Design a protein around this ligand. Structure first.
Ligand SMILES: C[C@@]1(CC(=O)O)c2cc3[nH]c(cc4nc(cc5[nH]c(cc(n2)[C@H]1CCC(=O)O)[C@@](C)(CC(=O)O)[C@@H]5CCC(=O)O)C(CC(=O)O)=C4CCC(=O)O)c(CCC(=O)O)c3CC(=O)O
Ligand SMILES: Nc1ncnc2c1ncn2[C@@H]1O[C@H](CSCC[C@H](N)C(=O)O)[C@@H](O)[C@H]1O
Ligand SMILES: Nc1ncnc2c1ncn2[C@@H]1O[C@H](CSCC[C@H](N)C(=O)O)[C@@H](O)[C@H]1O
Ligand SMILES: [Cl-]
Ligand SMILES: [Cl-]
Lengths: 451, 449
């Protein structure tokens, strides 16, 4: 984070503006609306300032900068056209540990003032750190269109109900569930906007009267292969409302940042699968809303079935949000479609890491007109090469390995089947092996990166 | 207003957190991300704090709150479970004019913490003034889905490019039109994030070379199998920026409802259309300078002919990209309670299409999950051939019609019933064959129709 956004309570707190022109006037108006106890220190003032001072709304100090005016201050704003003066102000503020904005130099000093979308008491602040005023304006335009004008009345009414919600629901889990219903009842929002107090009260009474599900919940969510843009809308929804998220190392850091910030997080793996099952079950038996966040898709070599197979008998509600499997993401981001024209009748998603005595069906895998995708197969790439050749696959069949597919770190190496063992030495886990004529299309379809 | 939002520069500035449990750890994570020179003071610390301390990321002071720890501090956060301690911290900070937050307390705080959407240098913060923390979270979720992951990359790159923008643009009206195209170029942002200097330089020169009104590109977007919640975040972001959306019947109405109202729409599906005509539409519209989204059911590269649509473009000089989607196999699997793999049931999953002809001995072999796309008409033949090439007659089979939608229909039985079960469903439907079908009785959670 370049900056930390905070929302300050300035009511009755001393603040100082140095400067007295149009810039100072805009900042002073903002600080006055926030209730600051404002002093303005400038050599000259535009007329808006003199009337403010006579009607008692702020104090004017007409003259050069007096750094002792910072002594009682919580915030300072340097708003002159003299960079020498502005720097004296910022230096004096920094020595007193007073957050200071230099209006014409956002990279100097110690805070910047964001653009504000006002749905009071709801506020949304936007800034690009001065690097890009256009982008901030384009975002502000877009945010103003997304936020209904009546949102403020919903937030206002919620604040008025917080005491009643605290009294009537004994646990935070119940309170949270009430609010999640409250904030999406469109009728309630309309009635507030119409000041229809009878209608507001009717829907409110009913919301308070509803029995709340105290049962837990286990949702398996497919994180996808790494690019946080490949999480589904519903997957984002589920992790944003989870009490606890049980996640593995194949879930990318970018995706974990999208988890509800107050959710508890439990890491598994690098842990035996039976202990994962117990965690999910036990945490849901406590009434908690559990998300098992899994790399790729939960039902393709993810053991997702094992994690749910006890829950029905145990009376635990569950659901599954599918994800982009490694095969799909790596295909798209390497320029290798899994199917194309008559290249492949079928796609085979194969595990390269099989049970101790198990052996893959090589005669079956080596058949023509298919795209083979090996998961967890790096260690066996030499055997895969030898077996596919022995069961009739052409030696010049193209192969590709995709390492960290869809991430900014993705790497792709490629060649023909007789190089598979050598090529696999050039990558590490997590990596996918693609075998089939579609690999040759990468020269025409690669769009994501050359690395 | 009742609170003034400011964006604080905390890099190497002394900040104090009082508390050492889960609540304090969340605040410490936030202040560390902002670069704060952080001290944490608590009667005891959970293990995350000692880990951080050993890696030199912060300083720990084990013991009761000592208000002299505030003497050089710019921000304070009271994050204990003891109201008396938190009030001592808040009073000590206020007497020093140090903005102070008390977590899970509205007043006695001189600042409150908003929900944060980080695209640094770009940042968005949402606050309801203490009235509605859940509303702030819900708005964060909405904004996180809408702001592309790498927007901060272009925001930073804008700097080293303003000398060139004004040497080529003298009017104020044109400069904004350039930036408007620049900041929505998600390809450039990803290439910057990829550290792909070759791609960055190529995309940059095109931004200056082409006319202002030209924004030609094609994005293949996987709509998923129907449920609008199964669109990816990037898929949503792309359809929100499209000049024109080209779609067909297997893109659900729910997904099309997310299409930016205003976008020109071209329907290429079944009514009462050769692929070449579709390829040319994408080509022609891209060359007219339009940002074109080709929305496809499921995933574009799994029986979607997405490759055919793109090879038209690579040698026409038209930039393109692909957003994968949830394929029908994955969506139907999740929503029917039939995992495609499970324990040792299946060593492989086969996604298969219903000149040429299928290899039946291959398809009949054990330890597979078969998923037939577009096979509804051949379902009687699939039954006969799988039986005749040795698949067990008692093998479970299922058909999923309109998978993931509110009208999803799942019928199931055994291989000898496949032809008759297929009469009970309509396209689009998936046929699933394999031992995993038997898990539906334990795992079906979605309503059947
Ligand atoms: C005043 C404020 C404190 C301050 O910062 O000064 C406040 C106060 C309280 N929160 C409480 C509980 C919850 N807090 C959250 C979530 C968030 N709380 C946040 C900030 C704020 N919380 C401040 C201003 C809020 C505003 O602007 O409207 C967020 C946005 C920012 C952050 O903290 O990081 C963060 C989401 C971050 C993200 O996910 O993006 C949830 C929901 C959830 O967990 O999903 C719940 C449960 C549901 C509910 O109770 O509503 C309680 C009752 C405790 C109890 O029951 O005893 C109080 C006390 C009270 O005021 O009643
Ligand atoms: N980003 C990535 N790039 C390449 N391969 C990946 C990958 N993420 C997962 N994999 C593959 O997936 C294997 C783990 S098995 C779990 C796969 C996951 N359920 C899915 O649907 O994709 C790894 O060994 C690797 O072969
Ligand atoms: N919602 C759905 N439910 C069941 N099958 C579906 C489906 N959507 C698409 N299909 C299957 O896909 C076939 C069209 S081929 C298109 C496949 C798409 N690219 C994907 O990845 O899913 C249909 O005949 C049907 O078998
Ligand atoms: Cl599995
Ligand atoms: Cl071959």
């Amino acid at each position: 984070m370049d900056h930390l956004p905070i929302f300050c309570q300035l009511r009755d707190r001393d603040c100082l503006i140095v400067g007295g022109g149009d810039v100072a006037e805009r900042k002073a108006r903002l600080l006055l609306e926030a209730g600051a106890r404002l002093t303005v220190n400038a050599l000259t003032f535009i007329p808006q300032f003199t009337v403010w001072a006579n009607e008692g709304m702020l104090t004017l100090v007409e003259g050069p900068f007096d750094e002792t005016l910072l002594d009682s201050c919580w915030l300072a704003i340097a708003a002159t056209d003299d960079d020498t003066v502005n720097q004296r102000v910022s230096d004096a503020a920094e020595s007193r540990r007073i957050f200071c904005n230099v209006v014409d130099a956002p990279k100097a000093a110690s805070f910047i003032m964001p653009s504000i979308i006002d749905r009071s008491p709801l506020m949304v602040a936007v800034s690009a750190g001065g690097t890009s005023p256009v982008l901030a304006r384009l975002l502000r335009e877009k945010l103003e269109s997304l936020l209904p004008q009546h949102l403020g009345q919903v937030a206002r009414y919620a604040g008025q109900l917080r005491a009643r919600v605290k009294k009537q629901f004994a646990t935070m889990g119940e309170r949270r569930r009430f609010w999640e219903k409250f904030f999406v009842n469109d009728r309630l929002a309309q009635s507030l906007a119409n000041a229809d107090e009878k209608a507001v009260n009717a829907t409110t009474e009913r919301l308070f009267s509803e029995p709340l599900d105290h049962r837990g919940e286990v949702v398996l969510v497919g994180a996808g292969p790494g690019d946080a843009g490949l999480l589904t809308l519903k997957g984002l929804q589920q992790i944003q409302q989870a009490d606890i998220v049980v996640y593995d190392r194949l879930v990318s850091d970018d995706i974990m940042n999208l988890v509800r910030r107050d959710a508890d997080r439990v890491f598994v793996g690098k842990v035996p699968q039976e202990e994962i099952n117990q965690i999910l079950l036990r945490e849901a038996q406590k009434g908690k809303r559990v998300v098992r966040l899994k790399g790729g898709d939960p039902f393709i070599f993810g053991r997702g079935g094992e994690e749910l197979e006890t829950l029905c008998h145990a009376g635990i509600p569950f659901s599954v949000v599918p994800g982009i499997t490694a095969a799909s993401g790596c295909s798209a981001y390497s320029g290798i479609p899994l199917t194309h024209r008559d290249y492949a009748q079928s796609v085979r998603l194969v595990t390269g890491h099989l049970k101790t005595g198990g052996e893959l069906d090589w005669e079956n895998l080596a058949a023509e007109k298919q795209t083979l995708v090996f998961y967890m197969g790096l260690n066996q790439a030499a055997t895969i090469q030898e077996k596919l050749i022995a069961f009739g696959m052409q030696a010049d069949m193209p192969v590709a390995l995709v390492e960290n597919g869809t991430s900014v770190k993705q790497r792709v190496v490629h060649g023909v089947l007789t190089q598979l063992g050598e090529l696999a030495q050039q990558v590490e886990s997590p990596a996918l092996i693609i075998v089939g004529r579609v690999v040759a299309l990468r020269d025409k379809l690669n769009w994501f990166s050359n690395h």
